[PDB]
C-alpha cells in the first residue's frame, strides 16, 4: 500500500485508538463474557435495553426487598452477559451497583462506535489502513509544535493542576494535538460568545476516543438512570489535570493515556455542593459547578484565543462542607462544547 503521509505522532494516535485487543481488554475489565457477548455482537439496542433494567433497579433501590431486587438484578445480567460460570452473579442492590453499571454501559456505547467504524466502510488493500481509519474520524488532527505559545500554556496547565492527593503518579506530555471535528464549530455558534467560557480537561480511556472524535462528547441516552451520575445526565469536566487524568484508568500494565481540552460554555453556573440527579437545569442556568474544596488560584487565570485557562496552583476555595475535593463542571447540551486539543500522556507510577 501507499504507506501514509501523516505525521508519526498522528499515526501512533490512530493505532492506539483503533486497537481491537484494547477494546476486548476493556470489556473483560467490566467482567463481560466475550464468549456470550463478543465485540462484534455489541449493539446499541441491547445497551439501551440494559440501561432500562438498570433504571428499574434504581427505582427498587430508592423505595426499599432482596426478593424483588434479585429478579431485576438477574434481568440486567440476561441482557449483558457477565463472566460468572455456573454462578449466581452478585446481587445489584445498591446505588454503587447502579453507578458502576451505568458507567460501564456508557463506555460500551463508545466501544460499539469504534468497532462499527472499523467494520463498516470499504476495504482497499492499496491504501494504508492508518489513512483509512484516520478518515473515518471526520476530525482534522494537527501536531502542535513543542515550541509554540499554545504548547507552553498547555504544558503549564498540566504542570500546575496536579493535585497533592493524586500523587501516586506524575505526568509527562508526549504529544499535543490540535483537533477539529467536522461541523462542531458550527454547532457551537450560539454559545461562542457566552460569558464564562473556559478551557477544561476531560480524560477517558483510550478505547473511548474513536467514539469521542467521531461523535463528540455525548450525554447518556434517555434510558440511562439519571441516578447513575452525581449531577445527572450531562457532560463532565475538571479544572485539575489529575482529576481528569484519573479517568484514563492507566496502570503499570499500560501507562500511556489520552486526555482532552475543550472550550466549554458555562454562562450562569448553578453551584452545588452535593449530589443532585437532574436532567434539566433550573431556568436561567447554563451549567452546574460542583464546588470543590480546592480550586486553581483565580488570580492566576490566563486567556488563550479569548478563552479562560484556570492554570493557577491549587488553593482553598473557602467552600465549607462539600462532597467534592476539586471542582467539577457539567453541561446538559452537547452544543455547549467545542473540543480544542488532545494530549497524549505518560503516567509515571511512583508505586
Ligand X SMILES: C[C@@H]1Oc2ccc(CN3CC=C(c4ccc(Cl)cc4)CC3)cc2NC1=O
- Just list the catalytic residues: 328
Cell numbers of 341, please? 486539543
Note whether 204 binds ligand X by CB under 6 A: yes
237/205 Cα distance (integer angstroms): 15
How many CB atoms lie under 10 A from the CB of residue 297?
15
Least gap, CB of 243 to ligand X (angstroms): 6
Stretch binding ligand X (CB under 6 A), from 153-161, 215-223, 271-279, 337-345: 215-223
Q: Does residue 338 interact with ligand X by CB under 6 A?
A: no
Tally the residues of the chain. Answer: 351
Q: Which of 202, 286, 289, 293 binds ligand X (CB under 6 A)?
A: 202
Asked if 250 is part of the footprint of ligand X (rule: CB under 6 A), the reply reads: no
All cell numbers assigned to 100: 458502576
Buried b / exposed e over 51-82, threshold 16 CB at 10 Å, is bbbbbbbbebbeeeeeeebeebbebbbebbbe
Rounded Cα distance, 345 and 351, in Å: 18
**206 vs 244, which CB is nearer to ligand X?**
244
The reply, when asked if residue 232 is annotated as ligand binding, is no
Return the residue of 176, 238, 265, 266 that touches ligand X, per CB under 6 A: 238
211 is in an annotated binding site: yes
Q: Which position among 220, 269, 272, 281 is part of the footprint of ligand X (CB under 6 A)?
A: 220
How many residues interact with ligand X (rule CB under 6 A)? 18
CB 331 within 8 A of CB 257: no
**Does 115 help bind ligand X (rule: CB under 6 A)?**
no
Q: Is 342 in the site for ligand X (CB under 6 A)?
A: no
If one asks whether residue 209 binds ligand X (CB under 6 A), the answer comes out as no
CA distance 110 to 272: 29
Q: Which residue of 247, 326, 332, 347 would you call a contact of ligand X, by CB under 6 A? A: 247
Q: What is the CA radius of gyration of the chain?
A: 21
Q: How far apart are CA 259 and CA 257, in angstroms?
A: 7
CA dist list (Å): 326 to 108, 154, 291, 296? 27, 20, 7, 9
**Which of 87, 89, 101 is CA-nearest to residue 57?**
101
202 is in an annotated binding site: yes
Is residue 203 involved in binding ligand X (CB under 6 A)? yes
Looking at 17, 55, 106, 136, which residue binds ligand X (CB under 6 A)?
106
Per rule CB under 6 A, is residue 332 in the interface with ligand X? no
Nearer residue to ligand X within complex by CB, 74 or 317: 317
Is 203 known as a binding-site position? yes
The candidate with the shortest Cα–Cα distance to 184, out of 7, 337, 31, 15, is 337
Position among 54, 55, 92, 110 found at the interface with ligand X (CB under 6 A): 110
Which C-beta is closer to ligand X: that of 37 or that of 235? 235
C-alpha–C-alpha distance, residues 92 and 128, integer Å = 46
CB of 235 to ligand X, least distance (A): 7
Annotated binding residue at 75?
A: no
Asked if 244 interacts with ligand X (CB under 6 A), we say yes
111 and 211 in contact (C-beta within 8 Å)? yes
| Paired strand residues for 303 | 308
Residues interacting with ligand X, by CB under 6 A?
106-107, 109-110, 201-204, 208, 218-220, 236-238, 243-244, 247
Could you list the residues known to form a binding site for NAD(+), using ranges: 202-204, 211, 218, 244
Amino acid at each position: 500500500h501507499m504507506k501514509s503521509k501523516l505525521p508519526k505522532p498522528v499515526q501512533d494516535l490512530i493505532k492506539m485508538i483503533f486497537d481491537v485487543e484494547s477494546m476486548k481488554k476493556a470489556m473483560v475489565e467490566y467482567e463481560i463474557d466475550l464468549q456470550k457477548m463478543p465485540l462484534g455482537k455489541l449493539s446499541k439496542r441491547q445497551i439501551q435495553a440494559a440501561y432500562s433494567i438498570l433504571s428499574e433497579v434504581q427505582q427498587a433501590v430508592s423505595q426499599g426487598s432482596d426478593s424483588q431486587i434479585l429478579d431485576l438484578s438477574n434481568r440486567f445480567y440476561t441482557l449483558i452477559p457477565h463472566d460468572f460460570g455456573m454462578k449466581k452473579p452478585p446481587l445489584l442492590n445498591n446505588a454503587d451497583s447502579v453507578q458502576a453499571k451505568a458507567e460501564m454501559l456508557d463506555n460500551l456505547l463508545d466501544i460499539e462506535v469504534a468497532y462499527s467504524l472499523l467494520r463498516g466502510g470499504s476495504d482497499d488493500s492499496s491504501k494504508d489502513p492508518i489513512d483509512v481509519n484516520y478518515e473515518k474520524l471526520k476530525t482534522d488532527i494537527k501536531v502542535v509544535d513543542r515550541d509554540s505559545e499554545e504548547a507552553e500554556i498547555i504544558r503549564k496547565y498540566v504542570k500546575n493542576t496536579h493535585a497533592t492527593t493524586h500523587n501516586a503518579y506524575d505526568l509527562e506530555v508526549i504529544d499535543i494535538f490540535k483537533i477539529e471535528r467536522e461541523g462542531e464549530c458550527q454547532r457551537y455558534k450560539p454559545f461562542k460568545q457566552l460569558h464564562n467560557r473556559r478551557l477544561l480537561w476531560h480524560g477517558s480511556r483510550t478505547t473511548n476516543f474513536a467514539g469521542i472524535l467521531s461523535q463528540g462528547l455525548r450525554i447518556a441516552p434517555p434510558e440511562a438512570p439519571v441516578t447513575g451520575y452525581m449531577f445527572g445526565k450531562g457532560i463532565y469536566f475538571a479544572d485539575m489535570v489529575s482529576k481528569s487524568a484519573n479517568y484514563c484508568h492507566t496502570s503499570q500494565g499500560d501507562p500511556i493515556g489520552l486526555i482532552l481540552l475543550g472550550e466549554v460554555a458555562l454562562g450562569n453556573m448553578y453551584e452545588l455542593k452535593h449530589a443532585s440527579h437532574i436532567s434539566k437545569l433550573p431556568k436561567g442556568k447554563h451549567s452546574v459547578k460542583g464546588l470543590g474544596k480546592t480550586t486553581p488560584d483565580p488570580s492566576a487565570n490566563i486567556s488563550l484565543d479569548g478563552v479562560d485557562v484556570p492554570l493557577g496552583t491549587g488553593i482553598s476555595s473557602g467552600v465549607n462542607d462539600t462532597s467534592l475535593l476539586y471542582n467539577e463542571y457539567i453541561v446538559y447540551d452537547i452544543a455547549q462544547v467545542n473540543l480544542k486539543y488532545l494530549l497524549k500522556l505518560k503516567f509515571n507510577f511512583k508505586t
